[PDB]
From a paper:
Microtubule (MT) nucleation is regulated by the γ-tubulin ring complex (γTuRC), conserved from yeast to humans. In budding yeast, homologues of the grip-containing proteins (GCPs) GCP2 and GCP3 (Spc97p and Spc98p) and two copies of γ–tubulin (Tub4p) form a 300 kDa complex (γTuSC). In yeast, the CM1 motif is required for seven identical γTuSCs to helically assemble into a γTuRC at the SPB.
Realizing that this would require much higher resolution of Spc110p-γTuSC interactions, we focused on obtaining higher resolution structures of the ‘open’ (γTuRCWT) and disulfide trapped ‘closed’ (γTuRCSS) filaments containing Spc110p by collecting new datasets on a direct electron detector and incorporating symmetry expansion and 3D classification into the data processing pipeline. To improve the resolution, we performed symmetry expansion followed by focused classification of segments containing three adjacent γTuSCs. The resulting reconstructions were at a resolution of 3.6 Å and 3.0 Å for the γTuRCWT and γTuRCSS filaments, respectively. Based on the side-chain features, we were able to unambiguously assign CM1117-141 to the helical inter-γTuSC density. While the density connecting the Spc110pCM1 helix with Spc110pNCC was at a lower resolution, we were able to model residues Spc110p112-206 spanning the Spc110pCM1 and Spc110pNCC. During the transition from the assembled open γTuRCWT to the engineered γTuRCSS closed conformation, the γ-tubulins on Spc97p and Spc98p slide past each other in roughly opposite directions, undergoing translations of ~6.9 Å and ~7.7 Å, respectively. Strikingly, our γTuRCSS structure reveals a cluster of phosphorylation sites, with many exhibiting in vivo phenotypes, that maps near the Spc110p:γTuSC interface in the Spc110pNCC region and near the loop connecting Spc110pNCC and Spc110pCM1.
Author numbering:
A (entry chain H): 424 to 704, 715 to 846
B (entry chain G): 413 to 505, 552 to 725, 751 to 791, 801 to 814
C (entry chain D): 1 to 279, 286 to 453
D (entry chain C): 3 to 278, 285 to 453
């Protein structure tokens, strides 16, 4: 219908050459086709909703799904092998979307196609690799969306993938911390013993409470960096992108497109248009290349942020460390995971001490306290290294210059 | 294009027209950096200045295209040496305070750069640098009055009934004379040159007929400003007085903490070192008063013998002695 | 880490708070008074998760995951008349043994211990009707007879019966010294369990409740049915990051790993800014964050003589940008007094206003909540002790605390009272001792 | 920066009522705080922020904190402007009915609730970032005004030691209560001389005189007199609210006006004004009439009123050459002391763009704050009454409250110290008039 209409329109002008009203018809046709292609993308192929179910899977703007997923996948991920079933993960995903707020999408009459695109892929790290670090989620887009929405294209930078891994770090820390918190609350609350016990038990209780406080310091720092990311980088750039995608919804009149250069010099882009000057007497939407530019701008803005930029010479390094900020932060997260490992070992051996002294009251296998004290020295040394690294990272941020980095550092202290 | 509004915003940025509070805000947020190092020191980290400016611009009105385009810059040439490229003045006779190197500029967007040429933009920029120097020394004397009337060390009644005069009373009298001179120079300039040219330009675009006529009025206003005596002939003596007032504000910020060691309020302790300090302050204060009086008589004599408004007579009335 | 939460309502005040809490949760999810979704079938897109606090029967009807229990059936019956068919009458339980023989802890704990089978069968029936279970929500009113006794036996059973799940009682505390003897007795007796068995517990003060209700309600006819309103508001804002999932805090386990550093410091203090969830004046989000530290906004006895905040957690609801939140926290980090042994800080959480709530005019863009783990929470407990000890040394009312007890002796019951008092003393000891920077040096230097 | 108004007393809150009605007229705010301007534009010509707070509703809240001992006057104000003021700033504490119009009553109402009032002040400052100083509106005759303003000055001279404490003090005309009125006057003047940074002084005699000789109502209703104080404060702060090239802070104004922290009592003058025979009073005529003793708001009428500092604020269509001719005339006319400079500072201010030129109002209007040698003549009545009554017929049975209550000796000592500091102020003014002020300063060098 559109082709017939505009072919008639142009053939009715074929005699005037390439005139100005030929350009009028060009403008009308451009507006119409771009409006309709946006409307088709949204209403017929769930463009907006796939953008959202992208921010809510690979950017983790919905934590219920990720917690349910990671629960159901504890049995598979925790196997530190590549010889995983890799097909039980299908059911893991089915039951995750089942046991989240995304069951309102997998059971939606029209939007089920949105959630049927979510699939997982495993990385390649070699033999002995851990199912926790090979595992990644993904989104499988076919045309038309695969043309407009940039996702882990087989030759792109896979920015969604690296973002998912960087936040999978935080999510693994959260899972292990909450599991260990429940185990430790069980351990401590199990000391409903008559104070006539040997003082070793009271010493255990005090030591375990102080270990709990140090673990809490760890987990607070972890959750703090996680919140900072998913609220000031992901959420911020996503709100920017969503503002862009609905720009015709009467936004603030920041019409002045300024060009800013690395030398500080700025200038308006092109020509200053007049304030709707009239002498004689319809949305402005975005086309395909413009939508893909918006999505790539969102993803770049997220990966250009200082706490994501890695592997180039354009990086500014944080003084008092001499390193790029993301290297420091990933070192902090690795130390966090090593701490949760030693702390789970400590909780296990504490359960052992308790159940052995409940079997034989200080009468058998008291030598567990040697391993207990060695693990105590280990966890306190690691906490000390942790606080050192935290002070290093705070000094890094405080001397960068950006206001938000200064404020993050101060909030971290 | 609402060129009236564009000129209004350009006069708010570079002339100070109806925008004194913005300049005061800029100074208070940036009072420390514009006096630091007396220069850009080894490409000093004056990027913090740019960051402050961009932070303020983020809170600026979005419909004000000119302040969105305002670029704070640090030019490697002092305001007098920049003026020496057009007028018969003389350069410094050493690094000199950072506000003397501070400047602004706008890449006026097409077509607005047809009327608002680069020549009138350079005139705007030099005028703004001069206005910033004046308002900066006025803010210096404001905060000096503040420290002289909010620090109990200075309000304290005492000082041997002799030290009080030769130190505090001479200080307050010289500070009052400095304040009257600076505020009177700024009054004369702002409301007898800047205001006159703003009013002339405003008269021009009341039903004009030629774009070249509007350009001519704009450039003639900025030339009347840049060729005005207090911007083109009194520049060296104004610089002298500016150095004197800056040294005196340094003296006051120092005495703020170094005066609590003189009267019993210091509770060596009122030993002969205290009297040595007292005599040194008497000598330095007499030095400041003498150099100020000499340069001020110089200023008055350069005023009377030259030729034109009666704002000059107001300046005389302010600075001439009994 | 994540799952569903059973809501156990025990005692008259607990059940009143429960009625208001379920009315609220219905308002924030369009569930109606009967469990019938008021949402038209034209909008099948839900961004929330009622599943944690409602069971969705295949009949498109939500039964609230609750077990209403009591001894005086009239209040639960009235609730069921107000929520017609909403709760499952197969969850209710009254034991039909008559009115309680007094308002003491002994009656509650005895009606609990005589029907432990019925109670644990109800709770097992509610758990097998789900898959992923995380914890409980007990509404308590610690200083009542029913409240104290039922909550005490409940905590005793569920400390080891479901020994992986995060139990949390929501204990309301009275204000008056009229019947202070029996009420403080019950308070200490049940605090034994709110310290011994529970994994978490929030506290409110009827004094500050009455004060803030008199302030915000333009009615000197302040009924406790208007303070259960604020209690439910606090519970709603606490569980908002569960009933409307978002970036950070999915479930209770996470918010507690943030809030409760060690199992001893587990009493929490609410604070809430002007709000419309009940029957305007305007501010910003910066104003909300600043008013969150107002003594006249906190719901527990403040006594803010330089209080020590060990863990603060904000919840901001509505149209809010992290810029004003960052600036407000920049102001409040140099204002709130945090003990120097901690290098952590305040946990802010930006939450989504319920899409089903009435579209608010932007005069009241934002609303907020603050949970705080501060040492000055024990001031509600000191008033209980400073009566219990003096009336217990004289043996007042020690006869009503032997009902069905295995210790029918006066002496051993006095011993149990003194043991619970020693537990509360240990609580206050740990609260005041955490203020000492050498608290962690038990491990940090003692190598 | 930011300036929080502080109204203490019945006179203080009347000044606040008329002042805020005026300031709301000038910025088109109305009586509810909602801008009477169409939101079609996002560009404003003024800076309301130094005196008004902006909430998320785009309503303007006057940064004021109203104080009183009888909630009747504050309730009258808050009912006149329904929804304008934020009631979380109003404070009376209802600490019973005042036991007389005694300075000790207000001073004790302050000493017993310093916690509450400083918490309110801290809260209102928390709604700002660049805070500059306070405006303390209060009379000096009454008990509430005098005592509460004295305690406010004592608390804010140190609780906020880097801010400008401005007082706009209305002094009384000789009334039947002359004894207690003069006692409160000297008691409060102790603090006005010791703590305030700048004190504008209004004499009720000249205020009533001018109000009668302008208003058509022959009976001088003191509420009508209040409009002159309101106009003076508006004119002072007009260089800040509607900014211009020169004076964007009260710091600059006072540094121009105040030589030392011993001569800081400013004598306002204004001409002309018409309220709810034009002659058009051209700007030269206005600048000349500014020095006519018939326009001063403090009765001086002296043949040698030595002006130390002068600062005129001309508002409207001002012709600078007229200003310069008038300055020539005045530099010939005005008697400046032979030890200081002869500069009269003219700040050519702006008229409110949202305030239309009212019929029978002048094209130009000017205000003068001057630091004369004879503002102490406002204090002579009080000092004479105090020295001729406190000697034998003391009324000190009313001033025994709080710590002063602990002994009549305490009240006697405080009255003596206050009279001593007032005498010190008068010695300062009479001394700085002589040429010998700088002899032993610069000549003996
Ligand atoms: N929020 C709220 N609290 C209440 C209400 N009624 C009583 N309370 C509080 O609950 C305490 C009493 O506990 P209850 O739950 O009534 O238990 P009880 O004392 O044994 O009373 P019964 O249920 O009649 O046996 C009182 O001290 C009150 O502080 C109410 O209606 N609403
Ligand atoms: N301009 C003006 N002056 C007033 C006003 N009210 C009182 N005064 C003057 O202030 C003097 C007394 O001070 P008040 O303001 O009445 O204070 P007060 O006497 O302590 O009375 P309370 O504040 O009620 O305790 C009177 O002699 C009046 O001259 C007023 O509303 N406007």
């Amino acid at each position: 219908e559109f082709s017939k209409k505009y072919h008639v329109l142009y053939q009715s002008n074929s005699y005037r050459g390439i005139s100005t009203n030929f350009f009028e018809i060009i403008n009308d046709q451009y507006s119409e086709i771009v409006n309709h292609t946006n409307q088709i993308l949204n209403q017929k192929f769930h463009y907006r909703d796939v953008v959202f179910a992208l921010k809510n899977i690979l950017l983790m703007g919905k934590s219920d799904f990720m917690d349910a997923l990671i629960e159901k996948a504890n049995d598979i991920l925790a196997t530190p092998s590549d010889s995983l079933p890799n097909y039980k993960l299908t059911r893991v995903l089915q039951e995750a979307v089942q046991l989240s707020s995304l069951r309102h999408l997998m059971n939606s009459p029209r939007n089920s196609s949105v959630i049927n695109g979510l699939d997982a892929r495993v990385l390649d790290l070699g033999h002995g690799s851990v199912g926790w670090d090979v595992f990644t989620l993904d989104y499988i887009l076919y045309p038309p969306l695969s043309l407009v929405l940039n996702v882990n294209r087989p030759f792109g930078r896979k920015e969604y993938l690296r973002i998912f891994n960087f936040l999978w770090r935080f999510k693994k820390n959260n899972y292990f911390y909450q599991k260990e918190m429940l185990k430790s609350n069980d351990i401590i609350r199990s000391f409903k013993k008559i104070r006539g016990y040997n003082p070793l038990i009271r010493d255990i209780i005090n030591k375990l409470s102080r270990i709990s406080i140090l673990r809490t310091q760890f987990q607070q720092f972890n959750s703090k960096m996680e919140s900072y990311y998913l609220n000031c980088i992901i959420e911020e750039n996503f709100k920017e992108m969503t503002r862009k995608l609905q720009r015709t919804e009467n936004k603030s009149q920041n019409q002045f497109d300024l060009i800013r250069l690395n030398n500080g010099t700025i200038e308006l882009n092109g020509i200053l248009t007049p304030k709707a000057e009239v002498l004689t007497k319809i949305e402005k939407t975005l086309n395909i290349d413009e939508l893909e530019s918006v999505h790539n701008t969102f993803l770049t803005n997220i990966l250009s942020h200082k706490l994501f930029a890695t592997n180039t010479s354009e990086i500014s390094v944080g003084d008092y460390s001499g390193q790029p900020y993301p290297t420091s932060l990933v070192l902090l997260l690795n130390s966090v995971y090593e701490f949760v490992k030693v702390y789970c070992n400590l909780n296990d051996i504490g359960y052992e001490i308790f159940i052995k002294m409940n079997l034989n009251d200080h009468e058998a296998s008291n030598g567990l306290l040697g391993k207990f004290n060695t693990n105590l020295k280990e966890i306190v040394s690691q906490y000390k290294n942790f606080k050192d690294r935290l002070y290093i990272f705070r000094a890094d941020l405080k001397n960068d210059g950006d206001e938000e980095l200064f404020l993050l550092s101060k909030s971290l202290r | 294009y609402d060129l009236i509004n564009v000129l209004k915003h350009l006069q708010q940025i570079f002339l100070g027209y109806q925008s004194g509070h913005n300049v005061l805000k800029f100074l208070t947020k940036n009072m420390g950096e514009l006096t630091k190092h007396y220069r850009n020191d080894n490409n000093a980290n004056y990027d913090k200045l740019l960051q402050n400016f961009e932070l303020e611009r983020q809170s600026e009105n979005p419909n004000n295209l000119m302040r969105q385009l305002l670029m704070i810059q640090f030019d490697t040439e002092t305001l007098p040496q920049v003026l020496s490229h057009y007028l018969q003045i003389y350069p410094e006779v050493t690094p000199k305070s950072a506000i003397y190197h501070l400047k602004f500029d706008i890449n006026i967007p097409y077509p607005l750069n047809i009327i608002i040429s680069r020549t009138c933009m350079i005139k705007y920029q030099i005028i703004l640098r001069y206005q910033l120097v004046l308002q900066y020394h006025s803010r210096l004397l404001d905060e000096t009055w503040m420290d002289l009337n909010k620090t109990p060390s200075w309000k304290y009644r005492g000082y041997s009934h002799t030290v009080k005069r030769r130190i505090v009373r001479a200080t307050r009298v010289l500070h009052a004379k400095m304040n009257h001179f600076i505020k009177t120079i700024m009054e004369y300039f702002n409301q007898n040159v800047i205001d006159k040219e703003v009013y002339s330009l405003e008269k021009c675009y009341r039903n004009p007929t030629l774009a070249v006529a509007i350009q001519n009025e704009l450039e003639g206003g900025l030339t009347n400003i840049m060729t005005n005596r207090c911007l083109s002939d009194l520049i060296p003596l104004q610089l002298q007085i500016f150095d004197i007032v800056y040294k005196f504000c340094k003296f006051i910020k120092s005495m703020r903490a170094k005066l609590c060691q003189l009267d019993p309020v210091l509770y060596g302790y009122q030993e002969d070192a205290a009297l040595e300090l007292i005599q040194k302050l008497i000598e330095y204060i007499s030095n400041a008063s003498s150099i100020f009086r000499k340069c001020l008589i110089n200023f008055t004599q350069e005023l009377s013998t030259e030729k034109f408004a009666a704002g000059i007579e107001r300046v005389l009335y302010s600075i001439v002695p009994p | 880490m994540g799952g569903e939460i059973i809501t156990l309502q025990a005692g008259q005040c607990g059940n009143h708070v429960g009625k208001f809490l379920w009315s609220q949760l219905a308002k924030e999810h369009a569930i109606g008074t009967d469990g019938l979704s008021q949402l038209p079938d034209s909008s099948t897109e839900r961004d929330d998760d009622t599943k944690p606090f409602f069971r969705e029967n295949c009949r498109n009807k939500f039964t609230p995951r609750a077990i209403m229990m009591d001894s005086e059936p009239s209040v639960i019956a009235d609730v069921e008349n107000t929520f017609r068919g909403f709760f499952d009458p197969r969850n209710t339980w009254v034991a039909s043994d008559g009115a309680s023989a007094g308002n003491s802890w002994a009656n509650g704990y005895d009606i609990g211990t005589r029907n432990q089978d019925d109670i644990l069968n109800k709770i097992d029936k509610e758990i097998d009707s789900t898959d992923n279970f995380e914890g409980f929500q007990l509404l308590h009113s610690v200083a009542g007879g029913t409240g104290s006794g039922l909550g005490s036996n409940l905590l005793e059973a569920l400390c080891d019966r479901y020994p992986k799940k995060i139990l949390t009682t929501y204990s309301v505390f009275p204000a008056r010294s009229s019947e202070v003897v029996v009420q403080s007795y019950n308070t200490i007796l049940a605090l034994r369990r709110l310290i011994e068995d529970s994994d978490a517990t929030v506290v409110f003060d009827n004094a500050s409740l009455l004060n803030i209700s008199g302030k915000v309600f333009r009615n000197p006819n302040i009924d406790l049915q208007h303070t259960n309103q604020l209690i439910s508001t606090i519970i709603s804002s606490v569980t908002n990051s569960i009933r409307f999932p978002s970036y950070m805090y999915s479930s209770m386990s996470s918010i507690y790993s943030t809030l409760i550093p060690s199992p001893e410091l587990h009493f929490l203090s609410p604070s809430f800014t002007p709000f419309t969830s009940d029957y305007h004046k305007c501010h910003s989000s910066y104003d909300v964050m600043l008013d969150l530290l107002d003594p006249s906004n906190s719901l527990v006895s403040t006594a803010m003589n330089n209080p020590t905040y060990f863990n603060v957690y904000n919840t901001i609801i509505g149209n809010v940008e992290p810029r004003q939140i960052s600036r407000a926290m920049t102001k409040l980090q140099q204002r709130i007094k945090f003990p120097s042994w901690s290098s952590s800080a305040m946990h802010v959480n930006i939450g989504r206003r319920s899409p089903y709530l009435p579209l608010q005019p932007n005069e009241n863009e934002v609303s907020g909540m603050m949970l705080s783990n501060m040492s000055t929470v024990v001031n509600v407990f000191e008033n209980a002790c400073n009566t219990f000890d003096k009336v217990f040394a004289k043996g007042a009312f020690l006869n009503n605390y032997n009902v069905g007890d295995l210790f029918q002796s006066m002496q051993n019951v006095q011993d149990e009272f003194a043991e619970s008092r020693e537990v509360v003393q240990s609580l206050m000891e740990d609260y005041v001792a955490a203020e000492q920077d050498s608290y962690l040096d038990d491990v940090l230097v003692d190598d």
